[PDB]
Symmetry: D2
Subunit: 464 residues, 4 copies
């Protein structure tokens, strides 16, 4: 039933068919212009951009901007997300998070190793394996340097080869042979690196760009500790991902990649480039994070809502859907309960079920970033920004129904004081916007909710 | 400088010129279909509808649906509000509330009495003055009966004639001669009803429909106690309002009306004595419900303009004020000028929120403000995405909330049954102010993170 | 059993060994105030300071006139005796007596031909405040506080309303004094009427009256209620007054000293000072608990709250301003059957209603916190009260916050809240669930059958 | 410098010397009268009671009631606590918690094994080891049965013998050979019984009554996971505690005990008695928990404040003292900061230091029972109930300066709803009652704070 797109070329051919990708043949400077073009695209809900000619490297390597920004397809703003996750172009916000959460109840599917892949048609070794051959975009005026990895995946394995992590972490260019990035000890990349430091050996790595579109979504997903992204991807699409052996490092990489950067991480934390392999006419996708709406919101926040939905359902909570509204910049989670939630959780009041949701979320990886969690009924679509704001304004008390917890916070969230940020300790709220029992509720006043179907059908016939 | 539209025909001709009104010649049943057509229009941002043919009364009286709903005019969703208030079709949310607040600093302009008006071309008296000859729309399935007044103005004078109140209150049809409605004692209509009840005499009234488009906005405005709407309308437009004498009741009604329902209120039922109308009458309706309708575009908007005027009169550095339409007239956004600290030394962010709360709490409008968000003026409160982003990223999940308990809006949704029954519940003032300009982090977007040459080069490539 | 003057009051305290005479000289400059603080804080007897540096044995000073009593098992005895009750009257019986008088018609006073307070009469230059002690009660004060436990009689220009207020009056020199005339109080309002006519307001300050007067003088009665009428209704008989020698004002015949004068528009001016042989000038040295700020002002404010809450038909068993909370907290105890008496309300609902009723009254601004509790706890028992708040008030919910006018002297406000006169006040819900749904209390009285308790009392008491 | 009382007889001889113990020679019924006599004693601040004749067992076994209740010694209400912890009869609230916290910075002192002890002068085995030989007091109405362990220690060890826990937990009698009690998995006793259960073996146990008076205080103390109570006692007193081998179980028990009950815990959980040993004329102390003031407040709450003081100081916080007020029934912790706290914690505001205190406490075992923590200055004595209430009323804002955290709660605390108790999830607050800087403060108005020393000395001469 899934319609999985197997590489970036298939993804781009589907966006072409829906007139949702534009080619720019005029030269664009990776120094700020490429990043600015990506921001213009996100903010004006423009087509994805194929930057065909870049200052410094010419037409050698293309750049794909806004790979999963909001779509131009009429009535389908989530189309790039839907297609990236093998769903219909018009799949809803609920169908998307439900598909991802459903795969969390399935057994992982191991990948398969292929003899060859287009990502190894061109191989650069030794002094030829130089990043100066590719664009080094300075994405924002104030950045420390060029961010080479914003929509690509870092691949590392434990020394024993028992666990392989695919993660999306920012990587900054130092020079043609060296890059750097953060190895936070609370995430897998850093935990795996510590195992390589204990054995006194450089950690082999590979960074892939322009893989099949579903990979960066799963690489952004806060899966539990023992779950490999490749296995989850396999369970999600219902078939094994095809991997190819890296040329210089005993790692398996997606065969769908446009570019593969291979090397070793040395404490010097520096990534040292040993080889670069790429398919003919390579494409390097970028993601330019900032205010809504970009892949921070359409990918990272969205897959975090799908993980919350899976965790809440695993705790046997009657959750209809979960969503991280794009306008709230991945600061809010909306939890919608089924209409029969009281029958499914018999001893709890509205405050009681909010206490239980808080208790369940508080025990997970993702709790620290939830600055606010709004608990609402499923008569509200949390992906409809007007209906969501209306529900919060009219259903959340101005004083009560707020559960405040203090603890770890997202250091990048905006709603914290300087001392809260410095201590890494601040407030997170769970807000109760649930209504009284369905029979006790006042009828909703709108076209859909206040008129009989024959009257609505007659009006649609006259006006639509 | 204002471009006032003197009646409903001028208003409709301007909407026609901007392709923002659609004529429906097929019959529409006032029983639910008219209300449903109005809701479809609001919710799909459709053109205003001129319901030309209505079952029961045919083509006699027309109905105007979504008279001040969101506009179809590209890039100008507030165009119906702007044109209704004599402004340019493209006037912004700020220009609109600023125009209304500016008129609060001006002296009232007394109206002028004219000898005749089109609203009296046809006069029905005695048994002919029957509301069954006009449409009686059942606007929502669950309503108690037909709501005859939703976008019309009820004119009422004190027994001494020293004060003339123009108000917009709900009026439900009982039969062809009788209507009923709420006379809340905290409003001028319920306060003036207490003066005519004390004298044991019936209160004369006159309800007008389809007046010039600016009247229902001022009728909805919570002006201070001693301020007549007619005087404010005169100060706003910069010229006197032309009134005509009522045929049967000693009240001065707008000469721009389509229909004038004259009568007297018994000690609460409205009893019809006369119905005058101009040729080919138009009866506008407003079908209140979820965003966005005239509850939001008129009532909430004029309440933000009054808050802006009151806050400025208290010498507060308020750049703008707005009642977001998506929040259903439950929230007020107060944006402070960038130099508010220089203008209000030596208050902290919490200090200025305390002062705003203290000022608002002393006014008429405080009870309906379920939440007030105090933000900086780098946020447009009429941009729903930017507003939600500012609240999510700038209001603490726990602190910077001033809670006050007292009178509430009995129709607001965020109250318990006991809070509604007591008429006593919580109202919050939320602090979403940034630290000083120099201390602030740079905003990350196309406009805020790139040099002008880089933005201009990108606009050249992509626009 | 009303005590008609300060000598009757002092004779009753003597009979209960609750007053001590200090014949050794005490300096009005700080020592008298320090002796009063030692007394309050050590729950010592009231002090009769006979010899005072500067004036000697002329005018005596009564310290801790209504401080906590030394009488075993009766700490509220000075309050009880001051209000004509039994020496052992409880916290509840005291506030209930005062609240009961609020349901009664005022009793007009009677004018007598003479009084002991006019046995001596100083006029002109003889009317010098320097003849009497001028105590500097606290190190940091601006000057001597002459009025701390006396009453300021004032009438409107038309003579239709007479206010008996207790306000702080500071000595400037031998003839002039100064004090606060807050416009939200009667003394500031009655003053505005005299300013509108462009005339000085005649006044009269009395010291050492019958002990019940300073309690009613501290009570926040409604706007149209005279203090002398309430006193008359409280005691059930008219208050005997006398015409002031130099001003058109009637003053208590029970006074020790009467200081008559005029208020030029804020300074005061003395005309005459009349007194009875061997005068006594009582003082009140306000500070940390427990003094007359707590035993009189806070207590009478709880009695007024009890009267207002009952007038709103609320099932209030008692009300109290705990002394340890320095007149910052009001405790409202509901009757056990409150749910039957207020049928549609939840615990939160009755707290909303109490808040709504209190918010409409004069006294709301000083209630920094109001705790709504059941009547199974005594709010005058500081241990039981703290236990009830700790175990029954949620650490997060059941708090109704209101913002508005505040007591500018309350401690729990920021500098900006004080400067704006706008800050938070809370109503806390500490009500238990329905009587059947409750857990049994674990203590001697609540966990054991009466035969078992009686057998234990026989063995151990 | 310590003056340790090595058994209950030494403790009782010291209370006799201070006229703080009374003997009852008239028979007292263990069914409710003994418990009622203990409550009368606590509530009237009476002497400790030695009940010499108890209905059913006569003069065989005595009962000591209110072993650490408030003392009758003039000016020394904490004397039973002070003497129990080897301090002077007049040691203050601060000196007591400071002594206990100081021992937390010291190395544990291993105990010593002795050949014999008075607690084994009489040995009952087989059918003779029957609890019906001793009083079985029904302490309260509501109690499911007789509570045999209220002021005694439960001694258990791990199968490997690497860790020995001395615990004070509820033990209710079933019959003459069987008892039951709670084995909370969050405490050591339940964690240790799981290890015996995994080996398919009953857990050996010993319960001791009437040991030296310091033991029940340390058994109530929430020490960290790897710290044995016997080692802490040794470090506290500055000398090894003397133990004797148990007769029928492989455990070491205090040689100072009046009574040893030895046996094995079975899952079907029930304590089964295999031997009872006791010294001549045994004394069985009881603690009758209820409203203030009993050993719940004078021992458990007090040692929890000492542990909080030790943890806060280990986090380098400038804490002058910590205390759990007796009137607040072990629901509140008061944290008093030193006057110079701002100099010692330079970048923090009053709210900032409260956030830091909350963060430190939240990382510890004791967080859950802290329904409220009040952060005050050290110009307030938190053991003075009037001054404490005055400080909270006048210094804590009616709305702000409250940090709320949600999580684990004390299931026995009163201030929780039925749903919060059932979920084990509810609110806990940290309240900011700190004054502004010392120069910015208003002077305190009282005898001590508003008058010069010569004026105070002159007044004391006149009136004292
Ligand atoms: Mg991952
Ligand atoms: Mg008064
Ligand atoms: Mg332990």
């Amino acid at each position: 039933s899934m319609k999985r797109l197997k590489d970036l070329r298939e993804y781009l051919a589907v966006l072409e068919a829906h007139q949702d990708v534009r080619e720019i043949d005029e030269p664009v400077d990776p120094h700020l212009e490429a990043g600015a073009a990506a921001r213009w695209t996100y903010e004006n809900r423009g087509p994805a951009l194929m930057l065909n000619d870049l200052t410094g490297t010419g037409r050698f390597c293309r750049i794909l901007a806004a790979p999963a920004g909001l779509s131009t397809i009429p009535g389908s703003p989530l189309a790039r997300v839907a297609l990236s996750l093998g769903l219909d172009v018009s799949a809803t916000a609920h169908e998307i998070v439900d598909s991802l959460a459903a795969a969390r109840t399935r057994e992982p599917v191991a990948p398969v190793v292929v003899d060859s892949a287009p990502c190894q048609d061109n191989v650069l070794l030794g002094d030829d394996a130089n990043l100066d051959r590719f664009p080094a975009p300075l994405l924002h005026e104030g950045d420390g340097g060029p961010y080479l990895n914003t929509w690509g995946t870092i691949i590392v394995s434990t020394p024993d080869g028992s666990f392989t992590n695919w993660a999306i972490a920012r990587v900054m260019k130092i020079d043609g042979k060296r890059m750097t990035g953060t190895f936070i000890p609370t995430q897998h990349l850093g935990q795996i690196r510590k195992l390589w430091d204990n054995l006194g050996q450089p950690m082999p790595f590979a960074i892939v760009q322009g893989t099949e579109p579903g990979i960066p979504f799963v690489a952004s997903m806060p899966l539990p500790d023992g779950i490999e992204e490749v296995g989850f991807l396999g369970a999600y699409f219902g078939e094994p991902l095809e991997l190819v052996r890296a040329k210089t490092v005993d790692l398996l990489v997606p065969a769908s990649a446009e570019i593969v950067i291979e090397g070793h991480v040395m404490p010097g934390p520096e990534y040292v480039v040993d080889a670069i392999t790429y398919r003919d006419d390579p494409i390097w996708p970028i993601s330019v994070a900032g205010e809504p709406v970009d892949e921070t919101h359409t990918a990272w926040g969205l897959v975090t809502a799908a993980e919350a939905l899976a965790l809440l359902r695993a705790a046997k909570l009657p959750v209809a859907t979960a969503w991280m509204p794009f306008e709230a910049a991945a600061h809010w989670l909306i939890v919608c309960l089924t209409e029969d939630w009281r029958e499914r959780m018999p001893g709890l009041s509205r405050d009681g079920i909010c206490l239980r949701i808080s208790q369940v979320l508080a025990a997970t990886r993702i709790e620290a970033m939830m600055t606010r969690v709004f608990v609402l009924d499923d008569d509200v679509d949390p992906s409809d920004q007007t209906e969501l704001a209306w529900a919060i304004a009219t259903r959340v008390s101005p004083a009560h129904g707020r559960l405040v917890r203090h603890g770890m916070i997202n250091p990048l969230a905006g709603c914290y004081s300087a001392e809260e940020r410095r201590l890494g300790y601040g407030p997170k709220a769970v807000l109760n916007g649930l209504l009284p029992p369905m029979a006790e509720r006042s009828r909703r006043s709108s076209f859909r909710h206040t008129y009989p179907e024959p009257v609505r059908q007659r009006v649609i016939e006259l006006l639509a």
